[PDB]
């Protein structure tokens, strides 16, 4: 059993979902070091069966500014997947509503399953 803080990790993305930042809480959860995620798209890590849903989610996030994903599976570093949900929020320029980045709060819902 793990406490709530340990099961959340923050990430930042460019508008195409490439990682620009990840907090170190991800490592104990699913193995990655933050530095190795940078520049990779979140889409590389989504389960095949969640890919179309997560594309729709991302479109909704860009249209609306803030979304909660459905439950989805994220590929772990050493195999298997963990169930996640992610709240996404677009950060803008107020001046001109130009999007700047996506801030994600990711919370696990399972152990690694394989």
């Amino acid at each position: 059993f793990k406490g709530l803080d340990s099961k959340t990790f923050l990430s930042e993305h460019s508008m195409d979902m490439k990682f620009t930042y990840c907090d170190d809480r991800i490592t104990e959860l699913i193995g990655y070091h933050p530095e190795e995620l940078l520049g990779r798209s979140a889409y590389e890590f989504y389960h095949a069966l969640d890919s179309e849903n997560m594309t729709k989610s991302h479109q909704n996030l860009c249209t609306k500014g803030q979304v909660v994903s459905g439950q989805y599976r994220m590929l772990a570093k050493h195999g298997g997947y963990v169930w996640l949900e992610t709240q996404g929020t677009v950060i803008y320029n107020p001046r001109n509503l130009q999007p700047q980045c996506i801030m994600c709060v990711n919370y696990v819902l399972s152990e690694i399953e394989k």
Binding site: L4, L10, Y21, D23, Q66, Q87, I91, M103, V105, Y107
Partner: protein, 111 residues
Amino acid sequence: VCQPTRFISRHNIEGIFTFVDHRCVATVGYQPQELLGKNIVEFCHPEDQQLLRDSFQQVVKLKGQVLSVMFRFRSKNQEWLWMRTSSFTFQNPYSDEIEYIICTNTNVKNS
């Protein structure tokens, strides 16, 4: 394109830093451990402090939506830098633990 200089932080509802991304060093010159445990208001220009307090007070009322604020933040070199902070609350929905505030802090122009 020129990437804006920014870092993420987490705050308790009073404004205390409870998590600071190491990109703070590049943005404002402090190590994370110089921010952690301090109130954000301790870095804010006197003229902007109350605005910043009232922003933190309101963001918990806005149903998780983003509240923005621009303020002057005192860098490690004791210089006022304009920061735009975009803030929203989060709570793990499987819990009733108290909300916290997630901020993205970008150095911006006042022009």
